[PDB]
Every structure is written in structure tokens, then in C-alpha cells.
Write a protein that binds this DNA or RNA. Structure first.
Ligand SMILES: Cc1cn([C@H]2C[C@H](O)[C@@H](COP(=O)(O)OP(=O)(O)OP(=O)(O)O)O2)c(=O)[nH]c1=O
Ligand SMILES: [Ca+2]
Ligand SMILES: [Ca+2]
Ligand SMILES: [Ca+2]
Ligand SMILES: [Ca+2]
Ligand SMILES: [Ca+2]
Ligand SMILES: [Ca+2]
Ligand code: NA
Ligand code: NA
Ligand code: NA
Ligand code: NA
Ligand code: NA
Ligand code: NA
Length: 899
DNA sequence: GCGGACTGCTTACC
């Protein structure tokens, strides 16, 4: 097989690399890499190297990496540019692996681990590491085994061995319900003291050294705690055995927080993977909370506080440690962020941990792309931060909208890049710009007949291929493939959801199919014969396939969009606001241009004139009021809801899209662009159910609307799905129960009507005080707590949630055992009625947790339900209903005087 | 006593 790297590090004049050889074995080699950098030279000096602008350069080979660094500094002192890859690790990887890396994941040691630390005095600071590590579970992906290190003897208690029999038993059975599919993969090891556990762990680590190291919060807790604990006990030299190169780096942040860097290891903390790649914003990021959200597994329920869990129930203590490690594996099997990371990493030829940085990722990609043409990359330069203009957003008239069709452009900014051919080395020149609306209205003089143009004034060559458009097209093509798989899985999902209305009573088995492809007629035929058993399991498998596809497409989308954004970041080698602005300005033109073209087409094809059909639009989308389109054919001529949905689908697909294609084709001509790539396709088909009192949709303002959707990008929903953007139902700061209640109000408004809404509202208002306090608590990040802390009391302009935290601190003040609110993390927030014993109007505590028993009963007693209902529920509901022009409560009328 | 304008903070949409 082709060789491929695992990890790479620069240590002085040496590149330390771990790699899988052509025989499949893991090796490690120390290479004294001789890097090359470049300097401009006279034209007369023949060469094969040129910078991206065509200027010749001479290659400077250095005896070592240190000599190359010094040269860079002297070239700075002289005042001349030093070209080439200054991150020598990237240069090494590029040289060593001059080919598309095909890797074998089964050969990469992926380690998932989690540790337990009993601490009687609050959170055990990893920097201090004063308390014993009394449990470690370490999953090795090559062995496919859970290595469990259990401390039986500790200054905090002596305990019996953990029982795997009991662990496997149902909770109802007194057991721990450690998933049966892993019981056989557990390798259990008890220890009579910590030193022996730790030393044993280090020896295990040496035989099975992680390449990818992950887990939940491993970077901020597990790793630094293990490192410092071992360092405190055995000394630093022993601690450094955690690095296959015996080199670590302690980077410190004073508030004492430490982040350790283990050379030769790529740490991908899963919480960081999840935050960057999941596209969620969660009220809490405890593994308990995320596991529930992702896998629908129950919360690991134990009696008593964690600080006393080991002493009282060591059996469950260890089982929960094992389960916590497995839950991250389960989440990854679903989301597949480790696969994504490996993929990206080997594509760009970077350290795997650098997938968190789109700039490093693209710098490496572009660099490799340019290296192949014997071209030389420019030196990084210093730039001041500058604001610059972005997308256009249409101000919508607040109102209801019965029938709505939406259209969106495909990969807008990356497409704009490819079309215009925007790249650092494809810049041709500039032109005198007319006001933006002159280009939008097609009044302005054609910018150029020789070059490709943006309305920001930039001109680019139409013949020369750009390195940026070239490499952004490659990833875009990947993105497009996976989206195909995603949508197919989605369409298959719906097919199964409908079939679940004819559950055929029988004992059957789930059909063998690749959900990434639209079910064949044969398969669709079979499906209509299965029962809830086989159907529900195919639905699950279809949804897992869809999610896997989502991860792959949405993060390649993120990557390419991040290349756009990078052009607007001063730390990007190819930073250039000429290009970044060329993209955004072109975008503003494109959108408002098609707004006009679409309006023109519809006023004509409908017959009317001067009517505004586009009611809203954001960046690259338009929402077309389709009332007049439906009215033409009249509602009578429709058999059911699905009928007119078919109608609009066909209408948009047959008439509107070709018209839009024509509109953009002309625009591309106007700007003399390299290639027409403005592909606007239909998005949503929304409207109330046929013959109902539902309003279909509504807008309250920019980025705040709801739509009752029947079709989305070709997927016809078995049941109508609510598309809600911006509204309180979508925000993580909104209490769970309020989100749910607000959503039902919206569903009722859009699907059923005013009467139904008032019915539900009256009900919710009556019963809402029985809601669990957590479900009705607000959520918020807690930044700069100390900034507003004046003697434990709110300083000037102290934010509401911060006030709540202070209230909390005072309430628990003194109790070293009470849960502490962490700077930067999130908190639940509740209002307290006047006269409460807390001495303030609100209180806050760490999100995703029950508030400490110390004060729980008092908080429950003094909750201000009235303020809760009015601030979090009624006010937003008032905004929804006012805009749509409805009332959530029956108004008083002249009829109120009749019996 | 408190509404309207401005600010900080937070969390959306693209
Ligand atoms: C979502 C998102 C969009 N944008 C910009 C660039 C996008 O092209 C533009 C529109 O975003 P989107 O229309 O939401 O997504 P997309 O057009 O890039 O690709 P697709 O529609 O097929 O899913 O807004 C960002 O810069 N960053 C982002 O995270
Ligand atoms: Ca011993
Ligand atoms: Ca788009
Ligand atoms: Ca059936
Ligand atoms: Ca054209
Ligand atoms: Ca099309
Ligand atoms: Ca689309
Ligand atoms: Na833990
Ligand atoms: Na159970
Ligand atoms: Na120490
Ligand atoms: Na049937
Ligand atoms: Na006309
Ligand atoms: Na969009």
C-alpha cells in the first residue's frame, strides 16, 4: 500500500514523524529536514521557480531549519521578501508525500479516554492535580477494547473490585446496564495504589501510543490532570513519557489554567469537534446532556453527589466511567467527526489537529497546489483589521403570507469566486464603479469587455485559471456528492414514514439497501409490506445515513465558505479585501438583480404590473409570494393540499427556474464573467393545509419568520414541517418548555388558525406553573463575571444573568462542596419574586444540572412564574401574533353583553 | 415614575 503519515513535529533541527509504512506497520523516524525558501532574483538569472505573479526566484537550500529561520529574520532586517512555506512541517509533509494520500483508518490508533477524580473540596484543578486519579477507561480503536484502570485503595476510601456481572445487569436488576455489546471488550485491571496504576498506565500508553487522542474535555481536563498528577508524583521526566518524543509544552493562562501540548500526538477533543462541526448551539455541554440529545439515552442517574459516588457506590462509579467513554464512541458513530477530520487532514496534508483552523487548512492546500506548478508562495504580511461590507438583506413588510415559494443559489460565495475567477494571482485591474443600484438596474456602463468583473470595481483575467477557484471547485464537488447522498436518504426517510401508516401485521426483517440512493421501484414495492418493527428500524437506518451525509456535506460547505472568509482575515497568507469585497458586492448585485428579474417575470406571466412578488430575501435567497399564482388557477381546481404543492413545484421548476437562468445568464454577460455559475433552484413550498384556517406563514422582520412547509429541495414531507428562523423557538437561551409552547402556537397559527391558537394559549397559561423548573429556566453564556463583581454584588451595568450568578455565589458562599459557576460556560437563569430570601430579582446556576440541594427548595418556592410567563412566553407571542395580525386572546366586543 | 435613545451582551441568519 501507499505510505501515509500519522503525526509530524518540528523539534529544533529535526522533523519527528510517525507514519504507516508500505507494509502497514507503524514506524517513527527522525529526519534532519533540509528546507528551502525563496528570494526574488533578476530576470537574467534562469530558473524554474516564479512567484504567483510571475516574478522569478532563486531557491535557497538551508543546512537545517534553524538556519532557514534566521535567514527569514535577516531578510526582514534587510527589508526584502522571503518567500516559501515558513511552516516547515507542512513543507516536509508536502515533500514526503507528493501524491494524493489514500489512508487506512484501521491502521490509525484512535484512543478514547476519560478519567475519574474524587475530590472532597470542589472541582479538582488539573493544574494543581492534588487528588488521586481513581479510575481511567481507555478505549483503543485498534484492539477494539476498553482498558479499565481501577483504583481500589485511596486516601478517600477503600473499595471492592468492580463486578462485570453486576455491571451488565439491568438497572431494574440492581445492575448498571453497561451496554451488552461492549461487555466482552472490557479489560479490567484493579490496583492497590495510585502509583502502580499510573505507572501501569504509562507502560500501557507506550505499547499503545495514541495517534488521535480524543474524549470529552480531554484537552482541558483529562490530559492536563494526568500529566500534572504524574509530574507531581514521579517528576517531569516520567510525565513526558506521554509524548512519543518525550517533548511536551506547558502553555499557561492566568485567571491557574494549563493546556499541555503532547508532541507526536494529535489531540482532537470531541467537545471541540462537536462545537465546530455539529451546527448546534446547546444550553449545556455535559456529556450527559449531549448524549441525551444525540442518542436519546437516559441520564446516568446516581444517588448522592459525585464527590461521594465512589465511596458509596464504587460499582456504579466505574460502570459510569466505562459508559462515558462508550457514549463518545456512539456519538461519533453517528456524527462521524473523526472520519471528517482524518479526511480533511490528509486532503490538505496537515497535522490532523489543524482541521480546527480553516486558514492553516487552506494555506496548506493552496501551497501544495502551487508547489506542483513550481510556483512560490508569498510571504505572510502584517495587516490592520478593517471592517468591510457583506450581504444584502431585504426589509420585509411584517405580515402573514399564505402561499410562499423560496429560491436559493447553490454555494453562493464559492460560486461567485469560480464565476468571476477571483484569486490572488488573477487580478487584472480596476474600473470606475457606478453606484451599486446602477448595476442592479442595468443602467451602468459595462465595466469591461476584456476582463471578468465585480461591481466593487475589480477586474480578473478570464483565461488564466486561479489557484483559489481551482481548489475551491475540487472541495465543492465533494460537497455536492455528499449532499446528494443526504437528500436521497431524506427522501427515503419520508417514503418509510408514509409506509408507517400501513403497518402490515407480521414478523419481518429490515431490507438490505443503500439509503444513499433513491429506493428502486422493487424496493419501494417491498416496503409497503413490512410492519412497525422492520419499518421503524429502516427509518432509523435511513436517518443515520442522512446524518452521516449531513456531516460530510455541511462541513465541506463550511470549509469552502471559510476560504471566502479567510480572504477577509489578516492572518491569511492571501488576505485581500479587494477580493473579499469583490465577492460580497457581487453578491449584493446578484440578489437584487434577480429580485427585479423575478418581479418582472411574474408581473408579466401573471398579467399584473408593478406588484412586488418577492417579499423577502437574505444574501442569496428570495421568498416569492405565490398567492396570485394560486389564485390564477383558483383553489377550487385542487383536490387536496398535495395538489397545489405539485402545481407550484411544477410551476417553479418549468417556468420560474428557466426564467431565472436567463436572468443570471444576462448578468454574467454584463460582468463578462468567466463562467455562468449562478444556479438558483427552488427551496421551500409553503402554505396552509387546503380548506383550513391556517395562515401558512409570517414575518416579523429581518431574519425572523415561520413557514408551513410541504416540500423542501425535492423532499415531499409526509407531514408538513415548520421552517422557523430567528424566532425564540430557535434560540438556546429560550427555556425548553417555552420553545415547545411557542412552537405549538406557531404550528396552530400556520396550520389551524386564530381560534385554535387562543385555545392552546388559554390552556398553557392555566397549567404552565406545573412545569419543571429546569424546563422553564432561561439559558445564557456567562462572560466576564468578575468584571461586574463588586463585593459579591452587581457592579454598574451588570447584565441580568450575571446578576443571577452573583445571587447564587452569595447563596452558596462558604460551602466548598457547592457547584461553582464557570467563567465562559453557560448557566440556567430564573427570576425571583419580591421578598425572596436571596435578596435579588434573579438567580443563576451551571446549565445542564440540578441546582444544589442547599438552595433548591427555596428557589422552587420563590420562582417568579408571572415574570417567566410574560417575559419569555407572552412577549414573544405578542410579536408573532401582531406581525401576522392575530390575537392570542379573545378581544372584547360589543357582543360581550349578550348571554 | 418612566419612555425613548444609546450601550453591552447574547444569540441568531446568512
Ligand atoms: C452559512 C454561511 C453562509 N455564508 C455566506 C456564504 C454562502 O455562500 C452565503 C449563503 O449561505 P447559504 O445559502 O446558507 O449556503 P450556501 O449558498 O453557501 O451553499 P448552499 O446554499 O447550497 O447550502 O452566505 C458564510 O459566509 N458563512 C456561513 O457559515
Ligand atoms: Ca501493589
Ligand atoms: Ca445558498
Ligand atoms: Ca403496508
Ligand atoms: Ca454567459
Ligand atoms: Ca436550475
Ligand atoms: Ca438548493
Ligand atoms: Na469524568
Ligand atoms: Na432499565
Ligand atoms: Na506541580
Ligand atoms: Na398496502
Ligand atoms: Na404587462
Ligand atoms: Na441562502
Amino acid at each position: 500500500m501507499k505510505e501515509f503519515y500519522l503525526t509530524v513535529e518540528q523539534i529544533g533541527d529535526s522533523i519527528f514523524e510517525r507514519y504507516i509504512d508500505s507494509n502497514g506497520r507503524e514506524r517513527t523516524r527522525e529526519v534532519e529536514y533540509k528546507p528551502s525558501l525563496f528570494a526574488h532574483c533578476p530576470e537574467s538569472q534562469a530558473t524554474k521557480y516564479f512567484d504567483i505573479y510571475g516574478k522569478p526566484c532563486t531557491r535557497k537550500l538551508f543546512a537545517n531549519m534553524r538556519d532557514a529561520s534566521q535567514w527569514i529574520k535577516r531578510m526582514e532586517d534587510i527589508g526584502l521578501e522571503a518567500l516559501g512555506m515558513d511552516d516547515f512541517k507542512l513543507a516536509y509533509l508536502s515533500d514526503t508525500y507528493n501524491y494524493e494520500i489514500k489512508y487506512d483508518h484501521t491502521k490509525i490508533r484512535v484512543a478514547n479516554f476519560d478519567i475519574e477524580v474524587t475530590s472532597p473540596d470542589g472541582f479538582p484543578e488539573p493544574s494543581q492535580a492534588k487528588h488521586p486519579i481513581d479510575a481511567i477507561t481507555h478505549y483503543d480503536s485498534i484492539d477494539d477494547r476498553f482498558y479499565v484502570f481501577d483504583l481500589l485503595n485511596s486516601p478517600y476510601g477503600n473499595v471492592e473490585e468492580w463486578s462485570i456481572e453486576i455491571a451488565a445487569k439491568l438497572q431494574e436488576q440492581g445492575g448498571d446496564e453497561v451496554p451488552s455489546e461492549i461487555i466482552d471488550k472490557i479489560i479490567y485491571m484493579p490496583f492497590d495504589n495510585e502509583k502502580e496504576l499510573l505507572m501501569e498506565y504509562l507502560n500501557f500508553w507506550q505499547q499503545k501510543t495514541p495517534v488521535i487522542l480524543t474524549g470529552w474535555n480531554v484537552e482541558s481536563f483529562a490530559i492536563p490532570y494526568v500529566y500534572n498528577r504524574i509530574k507531581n508524583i514521579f517528576g517531569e521526566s516520567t510525565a513526558k513519557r506521554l509524548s512519543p518524543h518525550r517533548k511536551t509544552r506547558v502553555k499557561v493562562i492566568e485567571n491557574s489554567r494549563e493546556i499541555i501540548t503532547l508532541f507526536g500526538i494529535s489531540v482532537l477533543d470531541y467537545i471541540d469537534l462537536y462545537k465546530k462541526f455539529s451546527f448546534t448551539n446547546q444550553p449545556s455541554y455535559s456529556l450527559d446532556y449531549i448524549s441525551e440529545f444525540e442518542l436519546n439515552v437516559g441520564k446516568l442517574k446516581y444517588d448522592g453527589p459525585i464527590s461521594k459516588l465512589r465511596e458509596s457506590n464504587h460499582q456504579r462509579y466505574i460502570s459510569y466511567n466505562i459508559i462515558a467513554v462508550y457514549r463518545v464512541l456512539q456519538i461519533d458513530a453517528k456524527r462521524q467527526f473523526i472520519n471528517l477530520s482524518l479526511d480533511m487532514g490528509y486532503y490538505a496534508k496537515i497535522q490532523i489537529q489543524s482541521v480546527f483552523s480553516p486558514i492553516k487548512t487552506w494555506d496548506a492546500i493552496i501551497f501544495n497546489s502551487l508547489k506542483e506548478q513550481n510556483k512560490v508562495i508569498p510571504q505572510g504580511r502584517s495587516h490592520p483589521v478593517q471592517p468591510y461590507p457583506g450581504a444584502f438583506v431585504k426589509e420585509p413588510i411584517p405580515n402573514r403570507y399564505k402561499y410562499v415559494m423560496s429560491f436559493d443559489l447553490t454555494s453562493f460565495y464559492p460560486s461567485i469566486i469560480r464565476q468571476v475567477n477571483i484569486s490572488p494571482e488573477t487580478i487584472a485591474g480596476t474600473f470606475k464603479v457606478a453606484p451599486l443600484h446602477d448595476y442592479i438596474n442595468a443602467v451602468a456602463e459595462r465595466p469591461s469587455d476584456v476582463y471578468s468583473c465585480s461591481p466593487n470595481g475589480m477586474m480578473y483575467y478570464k483565461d488564466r485559471d486561479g489557484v483559489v477557484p481551482t481548489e475551491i471547485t475540487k472541495v465543492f464537488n465533494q460537497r455536492k456528492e455528499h449532499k446528494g447522498y443526504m437528500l436521497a436518504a431524506q427522501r427515503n426517510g419520508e417514503i418509510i414514514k408514509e409506509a408507517l401508516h400501513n403497518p402490515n401485521l407480521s414478523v419481518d426483517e429490515p431490507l438490505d439497501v443503500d439509503y444513499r440512493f433513491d429506493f428502486s421501484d422493487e424496493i419501494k414495492e417491498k416496503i409497503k409490506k413490512l410492519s412497525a418493527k422492520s419499518l421503524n428500524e429502516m427509518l432509523f437506518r435511513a436517518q443515520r445515513t442522512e446524518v452521516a451525509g449531513m456531516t460530510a456535506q455541511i462541513n465541506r460547505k463550511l470549509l469552502i465558505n471559510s476560504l471566502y472568509g479567510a480572504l477577509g482575515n489578516v492572518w491569511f497568507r492571501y488576505y485581500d479585501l479587494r477580493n473579499a469585497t469583490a465577492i460580497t458586492t457581487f453578491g449584493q448585485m446578484a440578489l437584487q438583480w434577480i429580485e427585479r428579474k423575478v418581479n418582472e417575470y411574474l408581473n408579466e406571466v401573471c398579467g399584473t404590473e408593478g406588484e412586488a412578488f418577492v417579499l423577502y430575501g437574505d444574501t442569496d435567497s428570495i421568498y416569492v409570494s405565490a398567492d396570485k399564482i394560486i389564485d390564477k388557477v383558483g383553489e377550487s381546481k385542487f383536490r387536496d393540499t398535495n395538489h397545489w404543492v405539485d402545481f407550484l413545484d411544477k410551476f417553479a421548476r418549468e417556468r420560474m427556474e428557466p426564467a431565472i437562468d436567463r436572468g443570471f445568464r444576462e448578468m454574467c454577460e454584463y460582468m463578462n464573467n468567466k463562467q455562468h455559475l449562478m444556479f438558483m433552484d427552488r427551496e421551500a413550498i409553503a402554505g396552509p393545509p387546503l380548506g383550513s384556517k391556517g395562515i401558512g406563514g409570517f414575518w416579523t422582520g429581518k431574519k425572523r419568520y415561520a413557514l408551513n412547509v410541504w416540500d423542501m429541495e425535492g423532499t415531499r414531507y409526509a407531514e408538513p414541517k415548520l421552517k422557523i428562523m430567528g424566532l425564540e423557538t430557535q434560540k438556546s437561551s429560550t427555556p425548553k418548555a417555552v420553545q415547545k409552547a411557542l412552537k405549538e402556537c406557531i404550528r396552530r397559527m400556520l396550520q389551524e388558525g386564530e381560534e385554535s391558537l387562543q385555545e392552546y394559549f388559554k390552556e398553557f397559561e392555566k397549567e404552565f406553573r406545573q412545569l419543571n423548573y429546569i424546563s422553564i429556566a432561561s439559558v445564557s453564556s456567562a462572560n466576564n463575571i468578575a468584571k461586574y463583581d463588586v463585593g459579591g454584588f452587581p457592579g454598574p451595568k451588570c447584565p441580568f444573568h450575571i446578576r443571577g450568578i452573583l445571587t447564587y455565589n452569595r447563596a452558596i458562599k462558604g460551602n466548598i462542596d457547592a457547584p461553582q459557576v464557570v467563567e465562559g460556560e453557560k448557566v440556567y437563569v430564573l427570576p425571583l419574586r419580591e421578598g425572596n430570601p436571596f435578596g435579588d430579582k434573579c438567580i443563576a446556576w451551571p446549565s445542564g444540572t440540578e441546582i444544589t440541594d442547599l438552595i433548591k427548595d427555596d428557589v422552587l418556592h420563590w420562582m417568579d412564574y408571572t415574570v417567566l410567563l410574560e417575559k419569555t412566553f407572552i412577549k414573544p407571542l405578542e410579536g408573532f401574533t401582531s406581525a401576522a395580525k392575530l390575537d392570542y386572546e379573545k378581544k372584547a366586543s360589543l357582543f360581550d353583553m349578550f348571554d
